[PDB]
Symmetry: D2
Subunit: 344 residues, 4 copies
């Protein structure tokens, strides 16, 4: 075909989703974890449960061993604080970059630009399966249009990144997801695009997508009424009760339930991980004082605090954004459970 493929270097074979679903099917326990966590979050979003959704874990997964260890520690906190918090592990292996960089465990699991994406999908699905099988629900970022078919059945909640909240193809994707979805405000703090995204994702759509068989097809979606905003900061943080009030009034003006998830990290801590503890103190004060609009928080936490460059790597340390460590993580979760107790 003339005029075609000048800038396409190579085309390589990709396992279809059914190969990964057949090799790694959901166990009864894993399926039960997903189904109950989705239902619990739905109940929170409808305002029929005063517990707080807590999405917490590494910025990115690069080592499944450290991830399973983290998951085990977090599951104890989950069972302990279950009357106040719906704790969901952050399991992100699809990173959005400002220009170029490691896009995650799926795109390059060996972290060396070998781009063994078939291996990455196997590793990623096995890890998600093991975590859900242990009883801990998982949350992911939906950046790619094709990877969700391999993993979405093991996801109890999802986030559309700030860089794609305005994008029609991602609003389309959210409209057909089986889990609830958070939309981050814009990388410059724009709330309008996330409200538009929630309204768009709530409506039915018809668009082209790839099936479990690895074939493109026409898909029709129902619309996703389990979508909400995530406050992530802009040029300035936006977690204070002042910003919440403005965000609540905008949601209502737009006909949307006045509820928000607050990300303690990213632009809300100015990309310095220790200040997540500060945001926590502030957010706990709002909740404890009766703020019922705060239905969720997101925290970047790992076994070992800080970060490291892909430049021997340290264990349980982030290779992307800096995270809090486990002792801080333990205290942060109890603070929120206590703040939820007070609000009640």
């Amino acid at each position: 075909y003339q005029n075609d493929d000048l800038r396409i270097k190579e085309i390589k074979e990709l396992l279809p989703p059914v190969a990964l679903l057949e090799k790694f099917p959901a166990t009864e326990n894993a399926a039960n974890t997903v189904a109950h966590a989705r239902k619990a979050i739905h109940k929170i979003l409808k305002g029929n449960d005063d517990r707080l959704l807590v999405v917490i874990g590494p910025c990115s997964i690069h080592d499944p061993v450290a991830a399973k260890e983290y998951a085990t520690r977090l599951l104890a906190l989950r069972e302990e604080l279950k009357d106040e918090l719906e704790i969901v592990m952050r399991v992100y292996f699809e990173k959005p970059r400002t220009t170029v960089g490691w896009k995650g465990l799926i795109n390059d699991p060996h972290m060396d630009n070998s781009f063994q994406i078939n291996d990455g999908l196997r590793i990623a699905r096995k890890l998600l399966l093991d975590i859900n099988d242990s009883g801990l629900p998982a949350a992911g970022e939906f950046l790619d249009m094709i990877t969700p078919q391999y993993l979405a059945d093991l996801m109890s909640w999802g986030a559309i990144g700030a860089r794609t909240t305005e994008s029609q193809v991602h609003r389309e994707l959210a409209s057909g997801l089986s889990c609830p979805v958070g939309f981050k405000n814009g990388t410059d703090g724009t709330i309008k695009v996330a409200i538009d995204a929630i309204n768009a994702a709530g409506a039915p759509h018809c668009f082209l997508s790839v099936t479990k068989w690895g074939h493109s097809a026409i898909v029709n979606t129902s619309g996703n009424g389990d979508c909400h905003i995530i406050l992530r900061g802009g040029k300035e943080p936006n977690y204070s009760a002042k910003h919440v009030a403005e965000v609540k009034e905008g949601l209502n003006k737009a006909g949307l339930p006045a509820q928000v998830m607050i990300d303690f990290s990213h632009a809300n801590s100015s990309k310095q991980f220790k200040k997540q503890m500060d945001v926590c103190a502030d957010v706990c004060q709002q909740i404890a004082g009766g703020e019922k609009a705060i239905i969720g928080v997101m925290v970047e936490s790992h076994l070992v605090e800080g970060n490291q460059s892909l430049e021997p790597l340290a264990y349980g340390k982030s290779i992307t954004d800096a995270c809090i460590g486990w002792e801080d993580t333990d205290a942060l979760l109890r603070q929120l459970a206590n703040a939820v107790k007070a609000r009640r």
Copy 2:
């Protein structure tokens, strides 16, 4: 799984549309020559102006071909000064919801006859290119480009998707030049980052001409540039052009810009495109070399109309954004040509 997926329906693979509607020799020629002419402008070796002009959206092949004949005659008449490419946009990004264009819903009745839309779209693109008129499109969808991209001489990544990794990846592998619009709030940096990302090779998941998903490796696309489309305020004036030139150079990129006369640069007021035109013409004729292109929303008949009314549609008139009509279009093209001649001295 599939709780919110209502129905899944069969989709013709790209090779089916390619086999039914192959490029003629002259259509392939139109595309190859326009892509090369744009590359030459982008490298600084040609002092002509790229003009991407035509309907906000295609909804009627009949009016689109009548428009193309008129524009082709001016493309020929003004070719020493302008490289004229027709906007042939089959996909529209909506602020929230609405008609997504001819491919998604060709019958404009929410029947979503996408296989029909792909047939109509490629046939029209083939006819326009075969007449001698190159075509431009917005690359919004991740799967439709394999059906159409061999007939596109230039593509745009919209304001709402310039920051999106999968769109930057797509551009890194397209065979045509690509413009990146600034952010809907006016932010320049997202488009500069996009140019740099698109110029690098990538590895990502995509769909082949056989309709199967695959791993793809791109070489990177060096024929990318920024499109100024305004923000909270318009950004076409010399003060803004200067800041963007400096921002590109500081990022190691040639100081070159395409200026969209419409969208936020006209405050969505279609006749103000003529006012942007006057200002941009004065910049070009006064000596501004960085303005390598413009974009204009233009139809046979000015204004727009609504599909929601159920009234029979008027001929040659946009059902999306309001456009200038043919008479203004002719005048505007002659203004731009006169300005490019004056810039040469």
Copy 3:
């Protein structure tokens, strides 16, 4: 794995169907002929089904000139004959050389199968669009999706009548299907095949999208035997009566199509005229079980070897009668059908 040397891309059927869709005339031709052949197989029509044309197609130009000539005799003899043109692309062999128009359209072992499917479908479309129905041979489980909508009648080869995979295929074809007796002249494998093919089946098959899938068939009640000879010819009254008995003792209608060529002519193309004379005698004498015949026929008689330019309109596979004998043969059959009533 280790005996698979290379895998190349193949256009899916839907690509050929989009490029070459059936015209209204073509679909009408296929519809009318399939119904007419059904009306004959059900005993409700007394005309003779004549499948006639080249042993194999290797040149679309000669094939369309042949179709023009045959169409004229189709129209003139329509009161007696249901004339269907033989549009076969290959000579099922063991290896020899040429592998057929689809496999090797350029006749040079380049195996440009994508080119061959385009050429083969376009020709079928043109012939049907002109009003002339087409008959084909099903030797492949994947080719049919690209061409079967343009076929009014199909044959299963003698080397595959016993194959479960080919009987499965027949059970889902939209056209009548003829099963040849065995290369040795046995009728049991073809009665067994008519029975298997009349039953529903479930099997794996490639769809129009080029993807394998599970398919269910209704079973094909429009199947019949083709008498093609064995060690000796088997077209005579003695053999027809003997096959009728086998068909009756099987629950199947006592009806045959007789191939004048292949083993029945002792592989001597001119002897097809001798078979014609005999069969015309059976038919004029009142034999109603002969519902159809098959004839290898081209513009120019005889055959030629593929090496260098080729003679126009002459087979590069088995030898055929030429047009002069073909016109006389068809008129003999028409006359015989008349005398039968």
Copy 4:
């Protein structure tokens, strides 16, 4: 179009079965060794006998694994005289209609759960190979081979498909040796032709491991041999073996045969397999080096049953010898091998 196609349902691609059920280290070695061993026998560089033995058809994985454990013992005990390979036949060719085997209908109830069939068949095949017992099957379907062939040590083309181009093409690209059965009427020629065709390279349409149709090119299979299985009369006697050794040379192939003790050789009477075994054992004992392998229909319990519930260990297709006769037969074979030595 598709007016005889009732329904089209989704089918897992082979990569999906290959990913769920990958070959273990052990299973991979079982196949690698057994294929090498058969090649060495087929090249004349090993005096042992290839014994393809097991049920006519697998229909119960549980009974099949018990059988496999019993046969594996005899495989180790008799390893210096015999190279023993399980029959693990998942596909059965019918004379007309009937149960086509475990893959086509694993629940034996015309529900055609072919995705379940393929998971069942592959898991059983994988377990058997992992224990150390090589496996054999008939390659009948054109699409199922991609799901199983990496676990096959030896394959068979049935008598009703020996003449089929598509099956000879399939044979030319299989990574395992292939035996070709003589025609059902006993015709030897079709089988020699098939062996010649399969040793040659071919280009044809097939389905890949991703479930997509494609153009494939094969190298040719040199490890092919004839399988004598009777026709009108049995053809296992040294008279018939003589004629076949002669007919192979006349065609330029090695003079070596496999003898199937069942089907038309035992007149479809399973006890007669012991009589064929007596006769064939005397040919071996008497020095016949051409008999390189034998095929035997064996199950845990002799006889067969119709398809109410099913008796344990009894074939639901052709009648088989029971396990007591199987141990006896196998030791008869190993004894004659030590005699010929």
